[PDB]
Structure formats: structure tokens, C-alpha cells
Write an enzyme that holds these catalytic residues in place. Structure first.
Site, mmCIF file in Angstrom:
data_model
loop_
_atom_site.group_PDB
_atom_site.id
_atom_site.type_symbol
_atom_site.label_atom_id
_atom_site.label_comp_id
_atom_site.label_asym_id
_atom_site.label_seq_id
_atom_site.Cartn_x
_atom_site.Cartn_y
_atom_site.Cartn_z
ATOM 1 N N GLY A 152 33.417 50.760 30.386
ATOM 2 C CA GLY A 152 32.804 50.286 31.653
ATOM 3 C C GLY A 152 33.409 51.092 32.766
ATOM 4 O O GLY A 152 33.149 52.120 32.903
ATOM 5 N N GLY A 161 37.003 52.721 31.467
ATOM 6 C CA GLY A 161 36.483 54.071 31.066
ATOM 7 C C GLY A 161 35.511 55.511 31.680
ATOM 8 O O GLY A 161 35.913 56.221 30.517
ATOM 9 N N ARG A 169 44.682 36.836 34.764
ATOM 10 C CA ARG A 169 44.334 38.138 33.822
ATOM 11 C C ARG A 169 44.387 37.550 32.690
ATOM 12 O O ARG A 169 44.558 38.322 31.026
ATOM 13 C CB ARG A 169 45.553 39.274 33.432
ATOM 14 C CG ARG A 169 45.903 39.412 35.224
ATOM 15 C CD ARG A 169 46.920 40.579 35.120
ATOM 16 N NE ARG A 169 46.571 41.774 36.676
ATOM 17 C CZ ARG A 169 45.667 41.014 37.413
ATOM 18 N NH1 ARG A 169 45.975 40.181 37.849
ATOM 19 N NH2 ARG A 169 45.987 42.148 38.142
ATOM 20 N N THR A 201 43.839 46.615 28.444
ATOM 21 C CA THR A 201 43.007 45.211 28.234
ATOM 22 C C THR A 201 43.689 44.481 28.775
ATOM 23 O O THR A 201 44.816 44.165 28.099
ATOM 24 C CB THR A 201 42.720 44.879 26.786
ATOM 25 O OG1 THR A 201 40.966 46.480 26.743
ATOM 26 C CG2 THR A 201 41.803 44.068 26.429
ATOM 27 N N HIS A 261 52.913 42.653 33.472
ATOM 28 C CA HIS A 261 52.013 42.718 34.799
ATOM 29 C C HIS A 261 51.296 41.604 34.848
ATOM 30 O O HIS A 261 50.182 41.062 34.329
ATOM 31 C CB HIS A 261 51.215 44.079 34.651
ATOM 32 C CG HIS A 261 49.528 44.227 35.498
ATOM 33 N ND1 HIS A 261 49.867 44.586 37.171
ATOM 34 C CD2 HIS A 261 48.661 44.145 35.356
ATOM 35 C CE1 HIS A 261 49.048 44.926 37.022
ATOM 36 N NE2 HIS A 261 47.578 44.698 36.655
#
Ligand SMILES: NC(=O)c1ccc[n+]([C@@H]2O[C@H](COP(=O)([O-])OP(=O)(O)OC[C@H]3O[C@@H](n4cnc5c(N)ncnc54)[C@H](O)[C@@H]3O)[C@@H](O)[C@H]2O)c1
Ligand SMILES: NC(=O)c1ccc[n+]([C@@H]2O[C@H](COP(=O)([O-])OP(=O)(O)OC[C@H]3O[C@@H](n4cnc5c(N)ncnc54)[C@H](O)[C@@H]3O)[C@@H](O)[C@H]2O)c1
Lengths: 317, 317
Positions: B13, B16, B90, B121, B177
Site C-alpha cells: 500500500g 510499501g 492503532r 504493521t 508506539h
């Protein structure tokens, strides 16, 4: 008084954003990413600003919707366009993009009339011609990016055949950026060796060369059909940066692009893809390739395509 | 025998594709872009291939949907994720992405188990832990990218305050994160000068430092609210290339990433944001920062949130 170089990117969609990103990664200039869509340039510039320290670059990248922010730009790259990919021909975007360019032309003329302008907006040769007419900028300061992308594609396909580094393939595509573009096989060389020699040697067949010519011609649809949501944008951005570099670093680089040609190729004052020399004064010269009769004819047909779309534009609603 | 370096990008996407573009541009390795979505990876790979000759690179870039194409990969970078940007955290995407990661783990386990795997990811720290567990790769060969992106923002904001090149700001953000990330202000230096000193010199107030710390933790939303399409992707792709570089060039570079920490920061074996040393053997070491009591507490909270969500996933049906 040293002043940082500055590039304005009008249109911050797919290509525009990658131009900003590459220019900043190379620390070639500060970038002004302009769009009329709320938020897009601003967020792309912030995201790219964060990658700057990672690349070691001190380039500044900001997002804006105000033409005032492109004043003093040394180079303006125009990618602005109506939405949606062309279904069959880059010409389908003709009417809408000519209107956008009228507007971009006003911003430039007022805020950075001495800039070197590189158009990317399709249908390329006609857009560049339209831009130069409505903005009034000198012909040698306005050109279109296309040749570098068509030629990189032709060089790549040739290189993939012979299994060699594409930088060692010399090959030009000339004429307008559309189905009638002319990949000039007559002057292709691979490390100094002409194609005619590789044919005798048995390492490539004319049919194979023909398929490469065709692949080059409709390479855009191959990429666009696989991405589905749009047309190519990684290589078109790298190509625009190569042109901006040639100007900012006064390279005297030989760059096939759409430039105002009035004394070569038997045309008298039209924008089309030709090999040019780019430097600090913009398009500084055009080179005359050695074309075969069949090639001079295919060029002739390209030129007619350009003239035709152009007349169509001249008779727009 | 010299072999080309090889990097597989799982998930083609936004991020990447940018990773493929940069890696190619820098000729750091050949690239395999893998996606299960039809056409996307082939299309981006073809467009990027055309730009290699413009950048003077011989890197090969191909798109595929067959894990057998990632065999022999020296590094695997994972961006595969289910659609839709995070809302406030996330975290929400946990189960779908853990499911996606199970496939990639089996893919890597079979075709290139000696690879250095870098996860991107989200939810990062848990995703990384999950990938290592089900794939069975050495702990020191699996880590996640986050700190580089966070520390880059933290350095960028400190540098903007002082009007200096961000490359000359030294700064670490450790922990998860998340909103529980710890920008370690006590480890901050600008050309050797610490924040306390700048405090005393009256060049920055504590309020300003606080605001910088806050800007860092919420910076991702700022980008996402402007992109209106998804989350940041230019800077996260560059951060992952920097991690791949430290590995491939055996830099022994200080890389703040999500690694298997098991005798520092008072934890005995967990995946979290710490300053590592990466080289040809993966994560080769972890440095121990001089944290203040507050930061130790802040890191404390961060560490729990990891185990928390980590259990939510250890169960499920
Ligand atoms: N010359 C070539 O070789 C070449 C190659 C590839 C693509 N293209 C063309 O380049 C153009 C850009 O392609 P893309 O993929 O980046 O498109 P895109 O749709 O992703 O981006 C176009 C951008 O233009 C912005 N925009 C629209 N109207 C505007 C206006 N009036 N002023 C400023 N910005 C405006 C949009 O908001 C959008 O962000 C298209 O015309 C495409 O066909 C040309
Ligand atoms: N760690 C961080 O600092 C950080 C920062 C920004 C974004 N992200 C995260 O990185 C991930 C990727 O972000 P993006 O913007 O590139 O997302 P994207 O949606 O643009 O791309 C994700 C890709 O995953 C593909 N995909 C899905 N299922 C797959 C499967 N089973 N195998 C392979 N590919 C599959 C999709 O088809 C798509 O191309 C997300 O989880 C995002 O939240 C993490």
C-alpha cells in the site's frame, strides 16, 4: 547573497507528493507543495518534513493553497489535473485541464514570472503549448516532461532484453506524448553497439524490437490497468526532478522533452518531444536526430496528432 | 560469491510502495513487492522499474502475490494491514492484523527464515511480539519500526525550536508506539548542549519543552487529519529503510526500535521501544539511557499497556 533554491509543485496528488519527497530527499531545493484541496498538501508536507532528518536533508517542505507562497520559485512543476484516469486516450482530460492551467498561469505570471516551468499535466504537448500561450512566459522557460519518461521506458525495455544496465542503453522517444510517439530505433545503441549489429549477431530480432516499440507506446495503460485507481506517478516524478536538476545545476544535460521547436524536424514553431539541452537559461538548444525516412514519416503523423488535439482545444465550448 | 541484497516488502500500500521506491533509488537492494490485492504490487513495481534508470540504479523491482518469490530475502519489511486509518488508537485493528501476520509468518518461515524482519504493521509492539512467536525466528532478527519515526519527529520539533539542522539534534523516544511513548527529554542534546543548559540560558522554557513532548506523541493525528485518506507514509517508509540499511551495511548504528528487551529497563523479556545497536546480526545490543524517576514511571505505564493488549490477543476465541 546565497538564497536556497526553491521549487513550487502545483498539484499535490500522486506525482506532486513524490516530487516533493525526492527533491527533499536529495536536498535539491526547498519545496512549496500547492493544491486547492484542503489539507492534502499540508499533510503531505508535514509527513515529508519528518523524513528530512532521516535523509540528512535540511530542505524545507511546506503545504499551501495560496499562490502567494510560490513567489521567488526558481522552478514550477505543474501536475494539477481534473480527477480520474483517462480511459483510452490522454486527450479525454483536455478540456478540464486546459481550464486549470489558465488558473495556474495567472498565479505564476503574478508571483514567479522568471521561473523555469515544467508541465506534467496531460495531454502533455497541448497543455504545455496552452500554458505558454496564456502565461506569456518565454518559450525557452516553459517545457513539458514526457520524453524522459518515454525514453526511460524504451531504454528499460531494451535493457531488459539484453540483460544489461539501462544506463548503458542510449535511446530517444520523440514526438508528442501519446499513441503516435516515436521511439527512434534507428539511433538506439547498447554500449556503443547499434541494433542493426545485434540483429546480425543474432542476439535480438526485428520482431523483438517491434514489440519493444509497441510496449513503449502503450506502457502507460499497462501500469494504469494494474494500479486501477490511477496512472503512473513514481517514474513521472523522478523524471520531473531530473529536469529540475538540469536547470538548477546548469547541467547542459541532454533531455528529451516537449519544447518549442521551430527549426529542426521540419516544423516551424510547435511544442513536441525532441532532444533538448537544458541549463540555467532553460531549454538552451534542440538537437537533430538522424531519422530514417520511415521515422520521419511516423514523426510527421505524431505532429498531426498534436495539431489535431490542439485545434480541438482551440474550438472548445 | 557476491549476490545482490534482497528486500521483501509484504504489503504494497502507501508505505510499501514508498519503501520500494527509496530502496530502488538508493540501489540498496533488489525489491520484491508482495500484496494479495490484485494488480497493485505489479503496477507499482512496473512504474518504479521505469524510474531506476533515471536514478542510475540497477536495482530490480518486481511485484508478486506468491510468497515463494520472497525466498532468499535478506530483509523482510511488513506493512500488510486491513484497511481504514486508526480513529484514536492503532489498537482497534488487533485481531485482523494478527490474522494477516500469521500468513506472513508462515510465508517467511518457509521461504526465508534467515531474514531480518522489520514490522511496521500496527498495533506495532504487539504485532511484533506476535510475529516472532508464531514464526519462530530468533528474537534478535525480529523487531518493529516506531522509535526511528518517533525520535525523528521529536528531533525535528526540537530543531525547529532552536532554528538548527535537525541532524544535529540527538534524541530518543522509547517505550510503546502509542500515546504511552516516552520522548526522553533528559537524553536530548543539540550539538552537545543539553536542555537543562538551554533552560538556564533562557533559550527554551519548560512549557515549550512540554509542548514539544506533546506534539511528538500526537504528531501522527496531525498528519492523518490532513491526508484524509489514511495515516502518514512518507516518513514511516524512510524510517524502515534506515533500519534495513543498518542491517545490510552492518553499521552498528543506534536504532530506537521495538526489540526483545530482557535485561534492561527492568523487564525480563518483552518487545518495546528501546535504543538498539543493529548490524549484520540483527539487534546486537540495547543501550541503557539515564532516565529520570518520572520517565521511569512513564515507561512503566507504557510497558503495562503492552502486556495488557498482549493478553487480550493471547486469548480471543
Ligand atoms: N507528462 C507525463 O509523462 C505524465 C505521466 C503520468 C501522469 N501524468 C499526468 O499528470 C497529472 C497528475 O497526475 P496525478 O496522478 O498526480 O494526479 P492526481 O489526481 O493524483 O493529482 C492531481 C492533483 O491536482 C490537484 N488539483 C486540481 N485542480 C487543481 C487546481 N485548479 N490547482 C491546483 N491543484 C489542483 C488535485 O486536487 C490533485 O491533488 C495528470 O494530468 C496525469 O495524466 C503525466
Ligand atoms: N509503526 C508505525 O510507526 C506506523 C506508522 C504509520 C502507519 N503504520 C501502520 O502500517 C501499516 C500499513 O500502513 P499503510 O498506510 O501502508 O496501509 P495500506 O492500507 O495503504 O496498505 C496495507 C496493504 O496491506 C495489504 N494487505 C492485506 N492483507 C494482506 C495480506 N494478507 N498479505 C499481504 N498484504 C496484505 C493491502 O492489500 C494493502 O496494500 C498499518 O497497520 C498502519 O496503521 C505504522
Amino acid at each position: 547573497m546565497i538564497e536556497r533554491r526553491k521549487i513550487a509543485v502545483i498539484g499535490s496528488g500522486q506525482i506532486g507528493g513524490n516530487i516533493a519527497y525526492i527533491v527533499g530527499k536529495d536536498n535539491l531545493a526547498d519545496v512549496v507543495l500547492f493544491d486547492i484541496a484542503e489539507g492534502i498538501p499540508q499533510g503531505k508536507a508535514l509527513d515529508i518534513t519528518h523524513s528530512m532528518v532521516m535523509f540528512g536533508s535540511t530542505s524545507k517542505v511546506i503545504g499551501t493553497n495560496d499562490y502567494a507562497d510560490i513567489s521567488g520559485s526558481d522552478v514550477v512543476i505543474i501536475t494539477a489535473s481534473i480527477p480520474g484516469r483517462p480511459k483510452d486516450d490522454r486527450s479525454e482530460l483536455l478540456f478540464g485541464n486546459a481550464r486549470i492551467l489558465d488558473s495556474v498561469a495567472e498565479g505564476v505570471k503574478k508571483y514567479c514570472p522568471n521561473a523555469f516551468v515544467i508541465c506534467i499535466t496531460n495531454p502533455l504537448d497541448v497543455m504545455v503549448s496552452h500554458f505558454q500561450k496564456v502565461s506569456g512566459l518565454p518559450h525557452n522557460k516553459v517545457c513539458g516532461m514526457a520524453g524522459v519518461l518515454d525514453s526511460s521506458r524504451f531504454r528499460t525495455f531494451i535493457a531488459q532484453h539484453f540483460g544489461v544496465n539501462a544506463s548503458d542503453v542510449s535511446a530517444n522517444v520523440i514526438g508528442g506524448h501519446g499513441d503516435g510517439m516515436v521511439p527512434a530505433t534507428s539511433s538506439v545503441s547498447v554500449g556503443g553497439v547499434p541494433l542493426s549489429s545485434f540483429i546480425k549477431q543474432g542476439l535480438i530480432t526485428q520482431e523483438q524490437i517491434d514489440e519493444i516499440v509497441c510496449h513503449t507506446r502503450i506502457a502507460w495503460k499497462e501500469v494504469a490497468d494494474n494500479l486501477k485507481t490511477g496512472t503512473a506517478y513514481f517514474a513521472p516524478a523522478a523524471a520531473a526532478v531530473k529536469m529540475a536538476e538540469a536547470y538548477l545545476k546548469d547541467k547542459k544535460a541532454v533531455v528529451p522533452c516537449s519544447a518549442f521547436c521551430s527549426n529542426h524536424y521540419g516544423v516551424k514553431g510547435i511544442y513536441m518531444g525532441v532532444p533538448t539541452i537544458i541549463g540555467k537559461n532553460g531549454v538552451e538548444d534542440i538537437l537533430e536526430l538522424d531519422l530514417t525516412p520511415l521515422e520521419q514519416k511516423l514523426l510527421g503523423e505524431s505532429i498531426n496528432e498534436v495539431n489535431t488535439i490542439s485545434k480541438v482545444l482551440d474550438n472548445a465550448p
